Amino acid sequence: HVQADHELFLQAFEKPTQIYRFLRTRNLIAPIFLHRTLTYMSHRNSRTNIKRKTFKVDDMLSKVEKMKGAHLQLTFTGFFHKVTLEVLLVKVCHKKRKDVSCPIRQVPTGKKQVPLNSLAVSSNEFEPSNSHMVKSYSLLFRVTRFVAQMTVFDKNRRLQLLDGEYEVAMQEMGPTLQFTLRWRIFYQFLYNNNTRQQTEARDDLHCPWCTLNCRKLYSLLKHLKLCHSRFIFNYVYHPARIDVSINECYDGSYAGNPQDIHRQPGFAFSRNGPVKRTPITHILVCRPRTYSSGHNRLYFHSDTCLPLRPQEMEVDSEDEKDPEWLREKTITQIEEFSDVNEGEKEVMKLWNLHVMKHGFIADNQMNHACMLFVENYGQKIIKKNLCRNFMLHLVSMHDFNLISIMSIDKAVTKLREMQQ
Amino acid sequence: RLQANMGAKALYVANFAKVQEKTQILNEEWKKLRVQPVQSMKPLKKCTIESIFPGFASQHMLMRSLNTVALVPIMYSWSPLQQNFMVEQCTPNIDGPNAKSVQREQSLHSFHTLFCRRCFKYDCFLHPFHATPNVYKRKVEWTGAEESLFRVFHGTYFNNFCSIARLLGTKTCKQVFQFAVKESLVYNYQPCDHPDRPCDSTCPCIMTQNFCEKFCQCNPDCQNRFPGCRCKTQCNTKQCPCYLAVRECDPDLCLTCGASEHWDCKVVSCKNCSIQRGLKKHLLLAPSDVAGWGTFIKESVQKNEFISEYCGELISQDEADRRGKVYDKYMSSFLFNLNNDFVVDATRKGNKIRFANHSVNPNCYAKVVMVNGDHRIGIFAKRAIQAGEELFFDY
Amino acid sequence: EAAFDDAVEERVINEEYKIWKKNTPFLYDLVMTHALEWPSLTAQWLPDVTRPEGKDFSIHRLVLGTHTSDEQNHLVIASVQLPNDDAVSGKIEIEIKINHEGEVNRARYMPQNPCIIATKTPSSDVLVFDYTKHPSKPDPSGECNPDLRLRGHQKEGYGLSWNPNLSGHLLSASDDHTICLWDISAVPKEGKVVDAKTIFTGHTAVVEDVSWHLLHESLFGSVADDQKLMIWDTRSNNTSKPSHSVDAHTAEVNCLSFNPYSEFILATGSADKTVALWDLRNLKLKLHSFESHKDEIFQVQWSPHNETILASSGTDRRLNVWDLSKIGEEQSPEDAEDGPPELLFIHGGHTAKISDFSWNPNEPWVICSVSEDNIMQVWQMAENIYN
Amino acid sequence: RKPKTEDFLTFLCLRGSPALPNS
Amino acid sequence: KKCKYSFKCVNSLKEDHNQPLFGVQFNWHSKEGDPLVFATVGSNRVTLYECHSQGEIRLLQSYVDADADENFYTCAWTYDSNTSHPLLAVAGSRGIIRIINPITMQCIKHYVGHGNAINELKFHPRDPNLLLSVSKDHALRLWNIQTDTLVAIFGGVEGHRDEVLSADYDLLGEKIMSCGMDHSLKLWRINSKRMMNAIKESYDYNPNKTNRPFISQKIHFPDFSTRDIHRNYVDCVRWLGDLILSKSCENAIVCWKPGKMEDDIDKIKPSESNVTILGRFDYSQCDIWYMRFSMDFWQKMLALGNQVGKLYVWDLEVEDPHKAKCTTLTHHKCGAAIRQTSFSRDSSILIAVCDDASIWRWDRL
Amino acid sequence: DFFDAQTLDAIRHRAICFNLSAHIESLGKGHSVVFHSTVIAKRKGKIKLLLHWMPEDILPDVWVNEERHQLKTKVVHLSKLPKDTALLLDPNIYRTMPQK
Ligand SMILES: [Zn+2]
Ligand SMILES: [Zn+2]
Ligand SMILES: [Zn+2]
Ligand SMILES: [Zn+2]
Ligand SMILES: [Zn+2]
Ligand SMILES: [Zn+2]
Ligand SMILES: [Zn+2]
Ligand SMILES: [Zn+2]
């Protein structure tokens, strides 16, 4: 076992377990779905729907009805270190929608000289207004020649600090100041069919990286199978054995509108404002397989291989309206012919462009096809004097018994009637 | 032999002169611009640069990442197609001034040898050689161009003076009459030539184990020819005569199904002539979740529905063998054997249906069909396929 | 700084969406993840229903708005196929698309006449459509054909509500400190434009939700961004003083909803990361404040088939649903680690702002939801959860 | 075996970063 | 004549990764008098560098992509028309063409339309918005970054039948040459009405106003081809006025032009086959693939490297190129193969890269 | 796919910083933040000490009576913390996507 594949193995089990270690705290503090509501994991719940039978919403209020059944003289003192001091009320309000920082308001009362090595009166100057706007009211003590705050008002309008004498530390930008207030499983890893590591579960069923306390093994197995799908788990009773194995066929993609992938910057997200995508319909359960109708994956052009926007998918359907390189090839191939004249090559390329612009396989439709040609390029041949070789080509196709001769008479008479 | 050294020196100094004045005007253009300089950040990974020469300190700098990007698989260049492909006296202009007399057989020599019956084109990309010249055989002042025109006109008409007088316009009936008075004195389809003899064992059609068609110039009262279907319904079943053999419907013969209707629309009864009309589904390109690229379908289909048709360059067996031997390095073998004579190679040219992959559980399939003698591919559906699903068929 | 945080958060959201896609076949009886061509700021089930006796799946109908940019807005009446008690098939189909003046912010159907649908606009002039009169396809020219226009505001908004008892009585809100009330029953058929029957102005901030009281047509309720709820009596001839006014929240209030079974109890959802439950007999005491949502809430709807059930959703990308009967109940510690006991479910299958959601009035415990990232989900929780 | 499950992940999560997780 | 060049090795840096470099290009578009700047590139490590009179190569910026398996090949410098900011352009084996704005130090733009590795990038000299890109996929591409789209594809059925290795505009920006492993040196044109009005429609493109895709004007027919100038691979080709300079693994530069000596460059047909070998320059030890030479803005001289380290310099102002006085430069430490060299706007500074992560500098005296 | 070194290195660095500041894997046993008290202030009648915690100001300056030694190191679950201030540990735990 050289160090190269060992470190590769280490990184390959470091990145998904790092992602899961982040997702551990994420789903603990911000869960995605309640684990109690899972069918294979319901032992975590510890109640039933009995109380819903006897409940009555209108009788709730009486229950909470039975649940409902100052001169702040802040006196300073001599500091303990090795000056003047000022008191201030710091009102911290609630977070509004428009603002991201909390509202803070520092009302300084007044300064006073105090020794080292006065008082301030407040006759009911809380100014909270009882409007559900004062989240907290702290008392800051500014000094000079060390500043710090302390939570005075609690959440429920309760008092935190006691009355009488007291002391508190401080921090500029031991030293303090004084004042006087007064109102068993075992994972068996496997990479390239090699027993790289063998361990034993410390706890009985506490997940190793998710850390949920499930009192059943089948629920743990289904959780390891469904969640954390980068690995593959197999279990056989043989003390318990668990066979971890990388899934090298993951479905890693955007899992959404993928047209934002190929924006100008790398992997943009058009969250601000709307954006168009193609329609889809995914259905996974109806009465407990999958079934996905429509299209939800990005596309690319045929010849250019650039990204295809969702707005133009049905409109301007590529691979129709046959390309120009075939036209240029038909031009240069007959131009390469030596013993052919100029006007003959001209009417040859005109007939090639005509039959390519409108495909004709039916024989009888050829009787109409010449009638389109004078109706499509007649004005061109008068601009080049190709009527004689055009009639020669008409007689040439007539030699193969494709058209009748009175149709050719009608065609040339119609062509020469408009020419005059 | 060596009478261009001084000329080469002259051309080189002239090159130096013109590139010098070109660089001068480029400098004059560049002097107008005023761009800002680069500015670094105040110095996670690190990057240090040493110095082999002493006297210069080692310069460190913190690393700066870059925004990632979605990789795609490998694709070699190509171009689209809809039809198959194949790779292996002067007689002046009638309208020009220097025209001269020429007989009927020599005048139409370049036209008949280059004109093709099975596609109605000149020098197409699948018919290398014309069969025979007997296929078109049937039962006052005068310039050489007018002589040849009167010759071919009287050849097709056999002395119908009023008709030539109507067609030419300038020339009258009496003039043409007076001139004519003083004038006398599992194998590819291949059309064969045996007009006098009947269809017998020596004909190559029965040797190829295939039925004759309209393009062959044999007896019209033969039995080896394949008459078209006579089904009023869409004829997509086994009971149709065309569906017994690998052939598809005929435009002229299959009159019961209604294949000879106008091709401008798309709602038609015959659900078998989609290869001729080209009612293909709007496929799309995407990266496959199995191996590299893949083709997706837009609209929903049903069982045995017409998805598309494969296309590529037709080549011989040994040709495709050496081509695969060359592409073994690039390991991109999109080949598809057609029959014993010819096979398809689509690496350089093709359509989206090439990009499908191999799998043990397919959903589509291929079938050879002799459309008007041309042995084309048809990719149909072996299962009801929803939109945006992958396509797989065994090679 | 912020862009890289948003990028890695989008990566983590995609990972969580993949985890949800893996784990979803043990939580719900029905799941239908559909993406629309354009997003939708509104979704509502209609009471009509069709039940083919030969087939196993029933048909239901949805009203949906749109919010586009440099493209015509199409108000959508769509259909959906719900299996009832059997069966792995069912798709979405768009029945009617009607050209709309500008974008859409809110849309509500009349409970008396379900064909009549009131809709808001990004301008003052809200309007009302009747799709039975309109054709079954849109006009490519883009000139919309409004059936009954309505004016009286000076700006846009989100609030809209029909009166369930009295026909034509329609309330609407706007951020110009006004609440319009119209009565379309009085105008003749020839009159396509109607002036404000009355305008109420008692708030002092951006009003963001109003709703008629269900079993008493003579009053309604409202909540605004002045941290204020206001109950307005219609009998009084003073359009400034309300019937009641309460500072029901600490921050800007966003949504409200009345109970279908009861008449006094109601719920609100505000921007201080909370839902609250109130009673219309003593509005001074806050009964309870449900606090699991972590951001601004934007929609709450009581369930039609149950009384003690509540729902909420916002820009947190996780739709919460709560049970009131399970309130204040003791539970295991590990049961409390996931969340409070009253919190019944957290449908976190979305990947963007949950813009709107709604219940069905004739199926049990099923809802639809629409997000801003062109996502329209429908789902019904498992029977084992609620029993 | 003697190396437990959690001990490995902690060393593994750090991946040599100086978290000083007992190893 | 004498050498007339007093060159001396002023500095020789070595990086801390030991991966062979593949390209180097100076910021010619910068103005006069500013602090000069250039940039090298490894496999997944691009590094900008300053330069002073006393050899103090001050490191300025160094970006690295997350995908370590990518193998970068070349770099280029450009200026913006509106913002008047600089822009580096880079690519590699992943099939991507990134555009770095070094002021903001981000990946402001990226384009992807190739299947496999990019071999070289170039920019149209007069109009600074176009961007030609060579690739291993038997075709070239042309991007427009002001409107963020593609213009045309200089490849197809008539293109190279193997990997394409290099390409270059002319100095006026009206004709492009391209060479590769298929033993072909094919000419193109960007002066006809088709390319001009296609570029104009690309400039007039906007996906928000209308709703259509771009009409990509493919080019399946070059204006001149030949398979007799060389036998082995053609690693690099450049323009000199209306003459074609080219190299190969045969250890010789060849200077030639299409057709006869009197045939003008602006009137060559597609079926033209005759050539004219105007001159040759001799050297040795250049068997390895992916080797390059370089010129200045004035093109008064030429520089080349070899697979041992002893680089070479040739003059161009004097007459008689095949009798031109060459110049060699050696050292007792360049024990690796050189891949590319470059100069500044003027001929004062010369910087070369090598496969041992070494970056050598030379200066006039 | 969709998880490159650009996000992975930042996630690893922030996780290492959070583990160093909280000691989740070492002392927390994977599911507990371990806070340490500090002598912030005191007030004497009956004594009462106000203590501020070590890692950040997410928790309040808690008052206690004469279990001062027991509160030297307090383990607490993540969900047990207040929801309104549990985001300062790592700001990508939850962040509003559109930001407006
Ligand atoms: Zn787990
Ligand atoms: Zn043909
Ligand atoms: Zn025969
Ligand atoms: Zn025959
Ligand atoms: Zn026959
Ligand atoms: Zn048939
Ligand atoms: Zn037929
Ligand atoms: Zn038929």
Residue numbers in the entry:
A (entry chain C): 78 to 146, 155 to 167, 182 to 216, 229 to 256, 295 to 322, 352 to 361, 427 to 482, 485 to 533, ...
B (entry chain A): 31 to 73, 80 to 124, 272 to 322, 432 to 477, 518 to 727
C (entry chain D): 5 to 91, 111 to 410
D (entry chain F): 150 to 172
E (entry chain B): 76 to 440
F (entry chain E): 396 to 439, 443 to 464, 466 to 499
Paper text:
One of the key biological activities of PRC2 is to methylate histone H3 at lysine 27 (H3K27me), with H3K27me2/3 being most relevant for repression. While PRC2:EZH2 exhibits a higher intrinsic methyltransferase activity for chromatin and is allosterically stimulated by H3K27me3, PRC2:EZH1 has a higher affinity for chromatin and higher chromatin-compaction activity, suggesting that it may be more directly involved in gene silencing.
Using a five-component PRC2 containing human EZH1, EED, SUZ12, RBAP48, and AEBP2, we determined a structure at 4.1-Å resolution. The addition of a biologically active fragment of JARID2, containing residues 96–367, allowed us to improve the resolution to 3.9 Å. Overall, PRC2:EZH1 displays the expected bipartite structure with an upper catalytic lobe containing EZH1, EED, and the C-terminal VEFS domain of SUZ12, and a lower regulatory lobe containing RBAP48, the N terminus of SUZ12, the C terminus of AEBP2, as well as the JARID2 fragment. Aside from a different build of AEBP2, the overall structure of PRC2:EZH1 is very similar to that of PRC2:EZH228. However, we did note that several loops are disordered in both PRC2:EZH1 and PRC2:EZH2, making us wonder whether any functional differences could be explained by differences contained in these loops. We also observe this same loop interacting with the acidic surface of RBAP48 in our structure of monomeric PRC2:EZH1. While AEBP2 and JARID2 have a stabilizing effect on monomeric PRC2, AEBP2 seems to inhibit the formation of PRC2 dimers.
